[PDB]
Amino acid sequence: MGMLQQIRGPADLQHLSQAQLRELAAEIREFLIHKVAATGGHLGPNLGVVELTLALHRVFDSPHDPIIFDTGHQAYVHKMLTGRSQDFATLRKKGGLSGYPSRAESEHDWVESSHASAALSYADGLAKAFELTGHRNRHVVAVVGDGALTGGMCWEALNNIAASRRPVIIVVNDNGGGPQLLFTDLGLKYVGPVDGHDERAVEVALRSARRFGAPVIVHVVTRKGMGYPPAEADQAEQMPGWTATFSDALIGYAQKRRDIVAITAAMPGPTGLTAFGQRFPDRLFDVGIAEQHAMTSAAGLAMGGLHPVVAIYSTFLNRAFDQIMMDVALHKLPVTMVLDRAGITGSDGASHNGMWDLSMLGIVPGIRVAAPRDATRLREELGEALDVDDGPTALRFPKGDVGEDISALERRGGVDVLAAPADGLNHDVLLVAIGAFAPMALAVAKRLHNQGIGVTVIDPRWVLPVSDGVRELAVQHKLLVTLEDNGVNGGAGSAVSAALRRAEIDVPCRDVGLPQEFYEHASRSEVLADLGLTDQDVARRITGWVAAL
Amino acid sequence: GMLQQIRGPADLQHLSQAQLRELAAEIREFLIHKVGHLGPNLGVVELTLALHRVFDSPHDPIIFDTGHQAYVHKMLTGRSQDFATLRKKGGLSGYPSRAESEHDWVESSHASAALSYADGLAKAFELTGHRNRHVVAVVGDGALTGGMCWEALNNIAASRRPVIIVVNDNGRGGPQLLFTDLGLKYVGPVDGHDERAVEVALRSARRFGAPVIVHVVTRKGMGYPPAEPGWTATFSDALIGYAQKRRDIVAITAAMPGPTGLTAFGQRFPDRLFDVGIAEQHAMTSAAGLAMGGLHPVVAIYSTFLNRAFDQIMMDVALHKLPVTMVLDRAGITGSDGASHNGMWDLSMLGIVPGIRVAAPRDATRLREELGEALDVDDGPTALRFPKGDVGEDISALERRGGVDVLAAPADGLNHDVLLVAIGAFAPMALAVAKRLHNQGIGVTVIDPRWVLPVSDGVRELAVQHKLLVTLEDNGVNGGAGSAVSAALRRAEIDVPCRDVGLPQEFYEHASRSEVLADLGLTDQDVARRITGWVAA
Numbered sequence A: 001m002g003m004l005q006q007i008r009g010p011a012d013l014q015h016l017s018q019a020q021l022r023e024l025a026a027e028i029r030e031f032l033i034h035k036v037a038a039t040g041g042h043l044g045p046n047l048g049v050v051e052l053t054l055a056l057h058r059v060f061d062s063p064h065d066p067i068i069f070d071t072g073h074q075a076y077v078h079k080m081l082t083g084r085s086q087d088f089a090t091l092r093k094k095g096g097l098s099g100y101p102s103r104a105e106s107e108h109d110w111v112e113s114s115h116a117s118a119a120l121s122y123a124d125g126l127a128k129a130f131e132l133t134g135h136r137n138r139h140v141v142a143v144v145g146d147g148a149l150t151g152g153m154c155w156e157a158l159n160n161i162a163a164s165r166r167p168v169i170i171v172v173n174d175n176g177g178g179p180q181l182l183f184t185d186l187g188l189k190y191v192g193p194v195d196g197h198d199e200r201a202v203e204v205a206l207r208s209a210r211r212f213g214a215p216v217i218v219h220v221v222t223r224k225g226m227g228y229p230p231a232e233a234d235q236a237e238q239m240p241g242w243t244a245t246f247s248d249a250l251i252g253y254a255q256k257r258r259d260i261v262a263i264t265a266a267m268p269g270p271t272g273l274t275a276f277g278q279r280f281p282d283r284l285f286d287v288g289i290a291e292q293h294a295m296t297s298a299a300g301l302a303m304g305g306l307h308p309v310v311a312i313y314s315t316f317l318n319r320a321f322d323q324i325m326m327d328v329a330l331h332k333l334p335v336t337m338v339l340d341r342a343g344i345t346g347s348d349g350a351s352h353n354g355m356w357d358l359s360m361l362g363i364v365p366g367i368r369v370a371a372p373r374d375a376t377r378l379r380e381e382l383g384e385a386l387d388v389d390d391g392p393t394a395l396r397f398p399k400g401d402v403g404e405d406i407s408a409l410e411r412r413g414g415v416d417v418l419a420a421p422a423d424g425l426n427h428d429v430l431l432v433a434i435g436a437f438a439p440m441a442l443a444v445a446k447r448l449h450n451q452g453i454g455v456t457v458i459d460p461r462w463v464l465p466v467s468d469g470v471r472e473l474a475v476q477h478k479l480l481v482t483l484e485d486n487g488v489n490g491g492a493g494s495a496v497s498a499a500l501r502r503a504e505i506d507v508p509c510r511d512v513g514l515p516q517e518f519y520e521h522a523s524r525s526e527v528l529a530d531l532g533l534t535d536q537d538v539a540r541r542i543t544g545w546v547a548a549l
Numbered sequence B: 001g002m003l004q005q006i007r008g009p010a011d012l013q014h015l016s017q018a019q020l021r022e023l024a025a026e027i028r029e030f031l032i033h034k035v036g037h038l039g040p041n042l043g044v045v046e047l048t049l050a051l052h053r054v055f056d057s058p059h060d061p062i063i064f065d066t067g068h069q070a071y072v073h074k075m076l077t078g079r080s081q082d083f084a085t086l087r088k089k090g091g092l093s094g095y096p097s098r099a100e101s102e103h104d105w106v107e108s109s110h111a112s113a114a115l116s117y118a119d120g121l122a123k124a125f126e127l128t129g130h131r132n133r134h135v136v137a138v139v140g141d142g143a144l145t146g147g148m149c150w151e152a153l154n155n156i157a158a159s160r161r162p163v164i165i166v167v168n169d170n171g172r173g174g175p176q177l178l179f180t181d182l183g184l185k186y187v188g189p190v191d192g193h194d195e196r197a198v199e200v201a202l203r204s205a206r207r208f209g210a211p212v213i214v215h216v217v218t219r220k221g222m223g224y225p226p227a228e229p230g231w232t233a234t235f236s237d238a239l240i241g242y243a244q245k246r247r248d249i250v251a252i253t254a255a256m257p258g259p260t261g262l263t264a265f266g267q268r269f270p271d272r273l274f275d276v277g278i279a280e281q282h283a284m285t286s287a288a289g290l291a292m293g294g295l296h297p298v299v300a301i302y303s304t305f306l307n308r309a310f311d312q313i314m315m316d317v318a319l320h321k322l323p324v325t326m327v328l329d330r331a332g333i334t335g336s337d338g339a340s341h342n343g344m345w346d347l348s349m350l351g352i353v354p355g356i357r358v359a360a361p362r363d364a365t366r367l368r369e370e371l372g373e374a375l376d377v378d379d380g381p382t383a384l385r386f387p388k389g390d391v392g393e394d395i396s397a398l399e400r401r402g403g404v405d406v407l408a409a410p411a412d413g414l415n416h417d418v419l420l421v422a423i424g425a426f427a428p429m430a431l432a433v434a435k436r437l438h439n440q441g442i443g444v445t446v447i448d449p450r451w452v453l454p455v456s457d458g459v460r461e462l463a464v465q466h467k468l469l470v471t472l473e474d475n476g477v478n479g480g481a482g483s484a485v486s487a488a489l490r491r492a493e494i495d496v497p498c499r500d501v502g503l504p505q506e507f508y509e510h511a512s513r514s515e516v517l518a519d520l521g522l523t524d525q526d527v528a529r530r531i532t533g534w535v536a537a
């Protein structure tokens, strides 16, 4: 890999022959295949942008010309051409190379958000900034996938960009899951379609756009996984589960009920809805990267008498907040939302962690939110959600393997008592374990037992609204501690406190969960250990509170 | 006098063109008499007659985007006699209402959603085997600048399910982009005040048996030349004052420069006002881009509409630590525009945002001061929220303690019984509560924390000196300011009892702001009686 090890930055491409560029592209593909197989990450989407990224850095002068990747999962070649080729041994590892652009890593990186369809909106802003600061001849380049182009923010941005001569180059990276509408005749100059694996053709198209001195669309066609047949074959975004359990449960319920329909915002595979679609192909809708449309179209389906199940990863549901509020909840419609990747996900960094949903959903009048503690409770809570015919329901659960089943000692006022004070200890601490933190709560209760502190561990199952069961048990204990895989601001703990205070119960409450912060990438287990969300650190904390009385 | 003898749409079916021209004139006189959004309704008289001459509501659902222009629809569906009660408590809604009519589908005033509902309903009819239901979405040129329309059109374009997209274009503030060649059948432009031409175009669309755009051109206020407050005025004046001194300040509105107070800003600094269309999401992320280019954007979006921009505040502004100031007018109860207008979500939503700072001005001087403070934050998002309407006289403070303004303190001889944390617009009510409690021998410290989030050290310091903390907020209590104060105290190991007095987490029907507050017991009499109960306990 003689060619690649000589690239210090973009200008090192500037005097290469097409033969050298072709050799470099082959070295980049070999590098990506071997590095990304070792670390995991977005191999297919990066293989598809080798020639496109070489062409961008042969035409544009980054960062004078900002290169803004929509989503940013496809910026590995960009990082390799901006001095970070030696950092791939640490890709997506704690203290290592981010899976997304990072302002901390490089002057060439602008946007760290993985939330799709935002690049063109940043581009409009930056182009306006350059005008307002009198920066000469800065060309903002937005690299937008066909998937990202199905998001509404792109239409808002293109309307704004089209109103001005400020130079924004809209590079559509089309490997399609893309738009059903034409973007050849919107009033913006259109160049293409260009073969995105013909580096010279991409350079000519971009150079032509750069010289246009006004907004222009450059439509490039690429192949996801180009050069690596397994990635080409599977068209995969990256290389006993919660998701599988959801998938199987949903198929079970849809077998007994023709009114169930499923909706994904472009992630039928990862949400477990491909298996559902194979059994009920008329009842699965993939709406593109369009969480807002997923939710309001769900409202329309419910107005026509159906019970939509909308499966959207926790973090991405932020996009649909106003649709949950004004389209679903305002109309008392039975839409069930299923939020996979709830709580810390870790390795995709700050913009992927599912740590907002309990706080956001708590704002929605009349909402019912469940957090499954295990496989059986996911099945049961899904059935209970499907039985709610008069308002929105939500289930949230983490990525990865479902923990073993924990059967309750008893159910009181909706709440599952998982553990009660044993062998002469008293009702000291009510530990309210939200969702997947049940096993950690049981380990905390055992450590506290050994300190002489008696713990009742409950799973409220339905976290919102706060149930009678929680109020009934609270008054029997000296301290209530909520333990949640969610931001503590407006989270389950603050809701439990608010519900007790509303009921004139002033038992001391503590909110143990994620501090209201953006977390850098690391494994889930490393993020939780660094925050002290471990049975050892939580038991130590609760001991201090009980000692203080 | 035919309008009073229209029972529903079928009463138009056998009218002559001369009778339709008479009825349109009667509808225009009735609208002026009774109205609410007059201009938009005068613009859709012939369009609405034509819709109800072609489509069979509600077999053919007629969904108004935003729904402010559905008065003629109500008059043609048996509700003309109800206009005596328009936007009055227990009276006719300013928006479509499923409770009022089988002909009404969507009650949300939030623009650009109609096509998404239309997609879902069309899908439902297919899945339930309902024959020959044509969903009609009536979308304004403004509404069509919203991202939801692009998501909906992309989905609608993928299917033969009949959705008729009726574009009500009075902008020729609509799209800069062409919708004449998206892959969808396009009919028009049609003269929207030629009832017969509009029916011909619509009938063509109904018979097409696939999705179709019918482009209709209307004049807002048509037939009526005339159509052809203090808090906001204070914001406008203050922003102009700061921008005079600072070249880095830019203002952004999502299609509301006049009502947000930004027209006067644009008149002085025309290169520094951006109107992005009805595009709250783009407003916030373009703000992020402007801040990345070294500017300090001020984004003026009414409280309720800021819901749309939640993920852009989170992942585009806050994640990058960018200095965007959000200014939320119409914060708290607005009343007569009903459930989807009340600015009662913002303190709960903004509280989720890492590193956010949120101010709630108590008066004109504090709006000026807190805006100046926001403009000085260079490393993260700031927000100011204030109500619709006139602002009263300044409320003077006795002292500032850890950022917090003491508005009242217990009389010499009374104990420090209650810390009454008065958020923004409820300072006058908190001072009235304090005077009533004084008369019962109950000592009250009233504070305006000014910066509600994060909860200040001044709140923590005063809390430990009182027996009871009561927060009073013009916001939903779930995740609201009271719950945030409680959470901050408990985090600081302070277990002083806290009570969260504010709006229950409910959608409110239309009524005046005063009526809504009185019905919830948000009055100085009712709050003082509640606090008396707690103090006794």
Ligand SMILES: CC(=O)c1sc(CCOP(=O)(O)OP(=O)(O)O)c(C)[n+]1Cc1cnc(C)nc1N
Pocket (backbone or CB within 6 Å): A045, A048, A071, A073, A074, A114, A115, A116, A117, A144, A145, A146, A147, A148, A149, A173, A175, A224, A237, A265, A266, A267, A289, A291, A316, A319
């Ligand atoms: C990484 C991640 O979170 C991805 S990558 C991806 C597909 C992107 O398709 P596009 O065509 O734009 O790119 P391509 O990979 O080059 O084909 C999705 C749906 N997601 C999840 C997702 C969902 N919804 C939103 C709003 N943002 C993101 N990032």
Ligand SMILES: CC(=O)c1sc(CCOP(=O)(O)OP(=O)(O)O)c(C)[n+]1Cc1cnc(C)nc1N
Pocket (backbone or CB within 6 Å): B037, B040, B043, B066, B068, B069, B109, B110, B111, B139, B140, B141, B142, B143, B144, B168, B170, B220, B254, B255, B256, B278, B280, B305, B308
């Ligand atoms: C009433 C209201 O809240 C209206 S009507 C309107 C302009 C509508 O323009 P359009 O061209 O669609 O309609 P026209 O009146 O027929 O011209 C706006 C900005 N708003 C406020 C607004 C802002 N943002 C959003 C998401 N929804 C609304 N309703």
Ligand SMILES: [Mg+2]
Pocket (backbone or CB within 6 Å): A145, A146, A147, A173, A174, A175, A176, A177
């Ligand atoms: Mg793609």
Ligand SMILES: [Mg+2]
Pocket (backbone or CB within 6 Å): B140, B141, B142, B168, B169, B170, B171
């Ligand atoms: Mg209009």
